């Protein structure tokens, strides 16, 4: 990549990382000790913005005979960083050290033999990551609202609630606890963006007035410039799956004052401000003050 | 709460052929499972042919809908539909209400037919991944 630290998983930062892992070439001898010294040292920065949460390492190898029990004892000896090991491809190498890395480091060993098992295997690390949340009891049952995304059944722009469900059979005796560490599933009820627009009437204002609300990320929930189309990532080339995340500063013209208001609105404050601005016209051909 | 309590009394079955479960498979125009032919009414709010009587079931293509795990869900995810109804009746503005199970099947209400090749899997949807774990 061109990134040398942990970057947020935007729609743009996730395209630079998918155009560079689509270009790599295979050459040279393998060295797990150097590789895992990089991973454990990149999850130690704390200089940059980080989620400060589940810290996983996702190894993509074929096989080997190195256990790297020293690297896994210098950095990860308090069992703070999980290690998920994937053994991709059809081959004959010893998948022994690889299975040992996952168990000793609170992870899981996944096998991807062919291209048909890619979609079912690279989605189950959310069952391991859900173990510390299932055992937390009724303190993780919090409704969470997703970013604005296009519905699968064609309906427009919607946001969805969320509440996980727990396998709690045999909870009267609390004796099995063998499969009760996994969630039964996740629910959701969609709230269309048009429904929110009914609660913000605008016809008592002039056409220059409007409402808008943002996430604790800058992404707008409703805005006059938010259109029901997926956002772009670059120049297209010819030879509902992604959310519609449009930042507030990229929805209208950017100033120095507007950044101050955006930061205050993210924090959760209240206030007012009056200031001359350059507002782009609807036809995208004029600008006034 | 009702998806938790009902699962606690599923009474795991083994041969779901003598007793057949009734569900509406969305992706259709088989022994061991009976389908329903809904009535459908073109409606506002939504835009498709929605049915206010049961909930459809979406099972991905590479999941055999007559396996002993899928058929064992469809039996306990059937007391949900009584809670899918009381929610909407109290507040008529309710949009899609969906239960994304860990076995790949999602039961959404009101029932409606699904939308070339189909590659939908509920366990990969953004509203599911954000609730299955933490950042």
């Amino acid at each position: 990549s061109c990134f040398q630290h942990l970057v947020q998983a935007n729609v743009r930062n996730k395209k630079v990382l998918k155009d560079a892992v689509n270009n790599i070439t295979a050459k040279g001898i393998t060295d797990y000790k150097k590789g895992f010294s990089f991973a454990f040292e990149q999850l130690l920065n704390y200089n940059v913005s980080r989620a400060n949460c589940n810290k996983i390492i996702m190894l993509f190898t074929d096989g080997g005979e190195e256990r790297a029990q020293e690297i896994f004892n210098k950095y990860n000896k308090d069992k703070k960083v999980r290690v998920f090991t994937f053994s991709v491809g059809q081959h004959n190498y010893d998948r022994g050290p690889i299975q040992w890395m996952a168990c000793e480091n609170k992870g899981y060993y996944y096998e991807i033999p062919s291209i048909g098992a890619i979609r079912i295997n690279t989605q189950e690390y959310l069952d391991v990551l859900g173990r510390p949340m299932v055992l937390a009891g009724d303190k993780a049952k919090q409704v969470q609202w997703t970013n604005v995304y296009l519905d699968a059944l064609e309906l427009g722009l919607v946001i969805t609630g969320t509440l996980p469900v727990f396998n709690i059979t045999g909870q009267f005796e609390n004796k099995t606890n063998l499969k009760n560490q996994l969630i039964l599933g996740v629910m959701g009820v969609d709230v269309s963006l048009e429904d929110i627009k009914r609660l913000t009437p605008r016809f008592t204002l002039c056409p220059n007035g409007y409402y808008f609300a943002i996430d604790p990320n800058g992404y707008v929930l409703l805005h006059p410039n938010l259109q029901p189309k997926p956002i772009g990532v670059g120049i297209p080339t010819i030879n509902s799956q992604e959310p519609v995340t449009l930042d507030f500063l990229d929805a209208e013209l950017e100033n120095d004052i507007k950044v101050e208001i955006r930061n205050k609105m993210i924090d959760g404050e209240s206030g007012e401000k009056t200031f001359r601005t350059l507002v782009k016209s609807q036809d995208e051909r004029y600008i006034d003050k | 709460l009702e998806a938790e309590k009902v699962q606690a009394a599923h009474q795991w079955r083994e041969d779901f052929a003598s007793n057949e479960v009734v569900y509406y498979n969305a992706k259709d125009d088989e022994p061991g499972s009976q389908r329903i032919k809904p009535v459908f009414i073109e409606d506002a709010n939504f835009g498709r042919q929605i049915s206010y009587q049961h909930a459809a079931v979406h099972i991905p293509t590479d999941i055999y809908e007559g396996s002993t795990i899928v058929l064992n869900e469809l039996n306990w995810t059937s007391a949900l539909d009584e809670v899918f109804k009381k929610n909407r009746e109290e507040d008529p503005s309710l949009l899609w209400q969906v239960f994304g199970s860990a076995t790949g099947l999602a039961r959404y209400y009101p029932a409606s037919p699904w939308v070339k090749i189909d590659l939908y899997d509920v366990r990969r949807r953004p509203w599911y991944i954000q609730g299955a774990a933490s950042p």
Binding site: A51, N52, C53, N54, K79, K80, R95, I98, Q99, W100, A102, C103, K106, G107, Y108, Y109, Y110, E111, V128, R131, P132, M133, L135, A136, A140, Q142, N177, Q181, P216, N217, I266, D267 | S134, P135
Partner: peptide
């Protein structure tokens, strides 16, 4: 600003559920 609720590193978690020793 990120979420203030986090869930990791619980004591009563059975880590012995890999795919190589239990499969």
């Amino acid at each position: 600003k990120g979420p203030d609720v986090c869930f990791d590193n619980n004591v009563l978690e059975d880590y012995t559920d890999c795919g190589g020793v239990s499969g």
